[PDB]
Design a protein around this ligand. Structure first.
Ligand SMILES: OC[C@H]1O[C@@H](O)[C@H](O)[C@H](O)[C@@H]1O
Ligand SMILES: OC[C@H]1O[C@@H](O)[C@H](O)[C@H](O)[C@@H]1O
Ligand SMILES: OC[C@H]1O[C@@H](O)[C@H](O)[C@H](O)[C@@H]1O
Ligand SMILES: OC[C@H]1O[C@@H](O)[C@H](O)[C@H](O)[C@@H]1O
Lengths: 139, 139
């Protein structure tokens, strides 16, 4: 059954951590639903963001950090492996130098560490999705 | 108590119709929650949009139409009467030539009719809000 959205979970990340999310957009891509995943430095939603991942389904992905309350330099990708109307599996792996983002088992986005992943205390998953699965694992 | 979000209601609009919404953003403005209100030509969410109203709380408002599946020329306002953390009352009045948008009883946005308001069959209210009230009335 469905997890509450927004979904907030305490987390610790290091090299070899994976965050796995299964959900589905609430509406068709023509209506531009969003998905956002934020790796926060505190449990509080207003805390700094080590890794901001925002999908505008059918359009683009932006990634950023929010440091001392201020947004930094946006990275943009037009890569769109998400399929209109379908369930997705998103997995975000912590590599030594970067986050690796897989969608449905395909390498789709990377983002170099601006802040050590050890600074993360919380993950929030929110915007226009239903969520069936959220897991933090380690290998 | 809370109405389901996304919230979809069949509606007929003409000169003197008002759409009144009461809700609150799910999260602080620093996190840029959205509100969207769409006046659709059919019950189907993929149908054309006579009036698209999208708030990025703390940042801006965009208004548009979506005609034969294609988005038209965006109108942008930096007007932001919405208050961080607070309940809002949004009312959208159908005037002869335009929609008048009031926030907490203050005139905030207008948008000239591109399509007669009689073409509207459905209103959808969605994105990062909780909704306590939705009413269509006439004077
Ligand atoms: O560049 C500033 C903007 O960066 C984007 O990546 C964020 O999603 C926010 O919209 C922010 O305001
Ligand atoms: O985000 C940058 C790049 O990351 C890689 O991991 C992906 O395989 C795509 O090639 C993408 O363009
Ligand atoms: O100009 C095209 C864009 O217009 C905006 O007003 C809509 O919200 C959509 O994002 C659309 O894709
Ligand atoms: O949207 C255009 C204008 O609409 C009026 O109704 C409002 O009072 C604001 O002056 C706004 O700038």
């Amino acid at each position: 059954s469905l997890l509450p959205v927004p979904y907030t979970e305490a987390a610790s990340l290091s090299t070899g951590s994976t965050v796995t999310i299964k959900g589905r957009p609430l509406v068709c891509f023509l209506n531009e639903p969003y998905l956002q995943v934020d790796f926060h430095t505190e449990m509080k939603e207003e805390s700094d963001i080590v890794f901001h991942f925002q999908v505008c389904f059918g359009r683009r992905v932006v990634m950023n950090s929010r440091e001392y309350g201020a947004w930094k330099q946006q990275v943009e990708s037009k890569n769109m492996p998400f399929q209109d109307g379908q369930e997705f599996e998103l997995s975000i792996s912590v590599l030594p130098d970067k986050y690796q983002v897989m969608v449905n088992g395909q390498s789709s986005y990377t983002f170099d560490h601006r802040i050590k992943p050890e600074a993360v205390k919380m993950v929030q998953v929110w915007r226009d999705i239903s969520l069936t699965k959220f897991n933090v694992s380690y290998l």
